[PDB]
Amino acid sequence: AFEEAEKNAPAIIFIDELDAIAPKREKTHGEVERRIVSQLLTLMDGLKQRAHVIVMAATNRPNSIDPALRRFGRFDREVDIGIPDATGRLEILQIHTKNMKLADDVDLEQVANETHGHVGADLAALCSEAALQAIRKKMDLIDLEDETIDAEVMNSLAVTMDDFRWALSQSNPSALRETVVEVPQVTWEDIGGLEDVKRELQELVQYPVEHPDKFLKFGMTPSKGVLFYGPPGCGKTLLAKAIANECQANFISIKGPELLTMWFGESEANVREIFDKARQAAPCVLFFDQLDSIAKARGGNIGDGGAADRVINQILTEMDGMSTKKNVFIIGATNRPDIIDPAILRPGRLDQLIYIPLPDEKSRVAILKANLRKSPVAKDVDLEFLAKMTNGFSGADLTEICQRACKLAIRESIESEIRRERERQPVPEIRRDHFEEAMRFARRSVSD
Amino acid sequence: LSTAILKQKNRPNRLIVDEAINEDNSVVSLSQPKMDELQLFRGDTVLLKGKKRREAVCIVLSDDTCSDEKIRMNRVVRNNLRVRLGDVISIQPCPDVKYGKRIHVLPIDDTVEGITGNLFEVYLKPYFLEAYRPIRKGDIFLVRGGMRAVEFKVVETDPSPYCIVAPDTVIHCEGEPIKREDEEESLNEVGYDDIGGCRKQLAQIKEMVELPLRHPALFKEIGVKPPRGILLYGPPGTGKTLIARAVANETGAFFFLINGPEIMSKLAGESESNLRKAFEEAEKNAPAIIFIDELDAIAPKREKTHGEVERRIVSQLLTLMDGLKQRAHVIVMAATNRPNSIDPALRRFGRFDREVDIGIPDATGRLEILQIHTKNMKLADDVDLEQVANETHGHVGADLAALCSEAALQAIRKKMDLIDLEDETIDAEVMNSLAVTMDDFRWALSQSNPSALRETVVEVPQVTWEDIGGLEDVKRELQELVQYPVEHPDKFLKFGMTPSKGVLFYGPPGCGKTLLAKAIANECQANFISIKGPELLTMWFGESEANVREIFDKARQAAPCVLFFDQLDSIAKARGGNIGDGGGAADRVINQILTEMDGMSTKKNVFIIGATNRPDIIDPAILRPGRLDQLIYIPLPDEKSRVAILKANLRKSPVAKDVDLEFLAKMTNGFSGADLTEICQRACKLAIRESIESEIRRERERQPVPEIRRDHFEEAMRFARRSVSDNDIRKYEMFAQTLQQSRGFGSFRFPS
Amino acid sequence: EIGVKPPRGILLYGPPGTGKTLIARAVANETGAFFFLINGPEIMSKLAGESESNLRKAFEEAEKNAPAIIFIDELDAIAPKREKTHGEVERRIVSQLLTLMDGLKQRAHVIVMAATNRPNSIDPALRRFGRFDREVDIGIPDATGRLEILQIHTKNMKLADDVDLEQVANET
């Protein structure tokens, strides 16, 4: 190959997937692979110099390449093709859609703003999905078994803004296809009370993203750390569920002990991988449910050996180390914050500690209303009195009262149907007496 | 809009297949209004298209008794198009059909075995004599004559593929006879009709596969390239390979199969060479479809794999799928159980563009799967597939196929008793007597278990709700907890609330906590997983929490499932109990359990039941509503319940009428349920002792106890003792007292 | 006529020495089928691609010698769980076995039997219908069962009048 290139000089050689044939000779056991690396080293820079031949290469993992292949005279320059920003992905969309035919209502600015962590491949996938949706819209005209499509349907075929909206709804970064979970679709209306906490959560993600120039003028960097601590059942995980839907940033959900592994150094490698995955998809929200499982004070356990204490040390460097901060927002929910390592709780890592207490009388009315928004309930039932009696009840306790009332209503409804079927051979809404019977089984989950 | 492509569009050519009256192998009948609508004339030749890209040519006729939407054709025409009664085919004119010059036909072996006469004169000449029958390459037609009707296969026609058998057309039958196995395999092919419960998945797969090939002008007009990579993932037995087979059979494109490990070779560079050769064969015969089965074996993550050969193979596949030389007419499909093990660079645009989840079917989908599976089988009238579909909760398509096979073998088992089985052949009358009965399906249902949960299977002692004495209120709640969300999902949607799915049983030992779980394991209509407390603990660093995820994930796939934790206090603890407890793994297991019950994931019909003996040490987060909301206290039985326990234990045993259970329960004030059982077992032992000495005495003289008597119970009582002490009782009454006092003021009442 | 296909998979699990191999040999001998034996450890190969090549060769030879019975000793060693197996060779062996038992090409007139001490160690995919779909437990012999075993083993030997095999069965 090199002789053919030198024969027809000037020439360019492109080696796709360089890491496939150029691993480190120190870490390679196979003799053939090491001999190939040595041959590449000699050909690309050796005693007989190249006759004006340019060599190009592409690799996902530059750090797997042999160190001798990176010095000048041998892959002189390294060029970083990185994730585009909003303007870059707008340019990519404009380039992509020049061939495509689009309706007049399409707005590429909104599509560019909505796609946060997407790369050119992701934008191409979005365009293809939108076009497929347009074809689906024109499906009821055409027949699959027809020999050809009608000319009028072909002319009417175009990509509208609704197709792009649907594609955006289905769109997700290819880096984020493993760390994907199905969120139960909670909105800010589903949460009762916590109005001050709601405002802080929205502003924390919205301000750095929608108003980056405001921070530049005032000259201060944004704050991107939150810890939720409080009694069980008070809305810590609901706030994360609402963020997973309503907030305009990527979301990664981490169960606590997921990252831990049998092997010696893989537990900390999982921490590095999940933090690097969040940096690629910035702006991204990294949520740690049950943070006390992972972030526990060092020195507590004599024998783990030291893997538990080593994992938290990796998080400390990831959250705040010698690297430029990105738009990665880390939120943690803990039930017992007294055991969290004090290094985690310092400002710059988890600076904002928000305490979510038991709901008060005003909040309990809001919680009761939020549960009953989509439920048919008799007008007789007054939520103001019900919240007054339940004093130390949590948000989960109030929901359990409503669920048990529904079960009593369903039990009566089923019995009536059996009764009517029996005599042959009701309960439109939850009534006042259903809530009274459900209240006798109610109890305070969190003790004094 | 997702299933728009599946939604069939009414066309004048679409006709329902109907039974023939006088139609032979070469004619079909259409109603006069439909013929006039289609502008068809009597005597015209038409082109018939069926399933699995099967085509047939026949002569269209008129029939006043045929429906407008129906077409009449005999069994031969139906078999040629691989269609059955009620199916839909398309009829179109077939002009420019020329007279046949030379046709080659070959007979089927099973219709010729024992026939040694001249096939031509006996069968083919009278069949084609002055008939001008239209024939096509590959049709199978049956001809009467001789000693037995003989089927023939058309292997070559001139012109091809359509010709008219003219009087001067040369008909010859010399050649290798057709094999029965090949014909049976061709008859039994997988199509899109064989997949059930995957309607949206089939819609997506058709959109990527068939739509670009049938109508590429649409994609050219809209100016986009359709996706060329499909990844199918799901648990084993969901039908990924079945869908691949259906796509291979139903498509008019070159199909190549790549099993995962078969690519591997010991010689350097030969695995990548095999991949390159496969892909080159794909573009050589374009358009083409490449299917890679068990992709996780061939394409692991390059970062986490140590072998250089695996990395080089992943890189080669990566370059083949998306490289500098773009591929245009090739579509690559892959199937794997675990998609997350695949290299991330392979899950991208240009490499496996779309991912399709072939999940566990629901009741409606599994009913369709049963209907598809049992169409070939013989079923009696009493058999109803809806009940079998409802009673198979966690079953997947492979599980349903296993159930059908087991039911069929049970059906044979019944005929096994009648015959000696040593006969050289089975009698024809017994053969016709055999059919699949609903009893066989019930026996299979009893034997059937989902393949997902074969590790977590235990032999329950078959306890019934009648075996439990007392606990009437507890029984009703337990039945309603599983039955209500499963049998009445629409009621919860109407009221708009999710069900409650948590129960904790606590009380003194021997009061019926584990007995209730045994009754649920049998009576309740949901999958059951039994978990011993410390069963999930491992000395390795992260495996203890990994076992928690697996058991909770196993219950989600088999929903509705009941997850029972016996001795919950072993894995559930208040946390922070000790400075060092296995390096903090005990506290870390609780945190994993907390997220599984209530975390950032959609809730399924998974019911968690925990029986604890001491509930004061359990983590308060676990007892929170949404995890174990309903706490039920199982106390020592009172006088009324103790009478019920005595009858439940003594129901099977033959006991004399003179014994009084009411007095027996009155004196045993503080006994448990297990204490009362020990008294009855002790009475049996004394009766067995008296019976054994009596029969020994009778044998001794040569060389009694029909029922348990009062003296047996009286002697048994002197050994009886109260296992649960008074001090232990106050401990359980204390925890229950806190729960009642935590509620606040009693007798809640709305004002006015 | 009943319109079903018989199961093609057998999994025998029990303590070592219980007689699973002898049951397989008896089945293959009395029925007109060729007995082909596969040992799990000997399939293992350090070279990449050799092990599943050996599996393919074994299956093709069994197909050639139809009717045949394929017996695999220690299926747990050859085929562990893929998610818990760090080794690539064993995982590829499991995948090859899965494809050999079930795929686009359906094997016909071939019965695969396996013997393992621990059935739960096998990959859950290998327990699916169509591939070791039925599992048979060969438990520790009973008193009358071990008496019958003694009678079978002592039929060729000469036995005195004093000896009682039932006493030997009871003491064992």
Ligand SMILES: Nc1ncnc2c1ncn2[C@@H]1O[C@H](COP(=O)(O)OP(=O)(O)OP(=O)(O)O)[C@@H](O)[C@H]1O
């Ligand atoms: N403010 C609230 N408004 C409405 N529902 C609420 C609220 N707080 C809690 N809930 C209810 O609580 C349940 C979920 O509680 P959540 O997951 O938020 O608890 P948590 O504080 O994270 O507790 P844990 O420590 O157990 O994780 C749901 O039934 C939800 O409706």
Ligand SMILES: Nc1ncnc2c1ncn2[C@@H]1O[C@H](COP(=O)(O)OP(=O)(O)OP(=O)(O)O)[C@@H](O)[C@H]1O
């Ligand atoms: N949706 C379905 N409709 C009808 N039959 C089905 C369906 N799903 C599975 N089956 C039946 O179950 C079997 C499917 O096995 P198949 O090889 O397709 O499964 P798989 O999920 O691809 O396998 P694995 O993941 O173990 O490689 C066949 O016998 C098929 O008849």
Ligand SMILES: Nc1ncnc2c1ncn2[C@@H]1O[C@H](COP(=O)(O)OP(=O)(O)OP(=O)(O)O)[C@@H](O)[C@H]1O
């Ligand atoms: N209500 C009852 N009716 C019939 N038998 C009962 C009843 N309660 C207990 N028993 C008997 O008690 C014995 C064991 O009871 P079980 O296993 O249900 O106790 P448990 O509450 O789980 O106790 P432990 O705390 O010791 O695990 C069995 O023989 C069972 O038949």
Ligand SMILES: Nc1ncnc2c1ncn2[C@@H]1O[C@H](COP(=O)(O)OP(=O)(O)O)[C@@H](O)[C@H]1O
């Ligand atoms: N049920 C049995 N009846 C008679 N002999 C048996 C039985 N089970 C085991 N054996 C004896 O065990 C010996 C071989 O054991 P083997 O079947 O190889 O053990 P495994 O089942 O572990 O492969 C044979 O010599 C045979 O006589």
Ligand SMILES: [Mg+2]
């Ligand atoms: Mg939570």
Ligand SMILES: [Mg+2]
């Ligand atoms: Mg498969």
Ligand SMILES: [Mg+2]
């Ligand atoms: Mg118990």
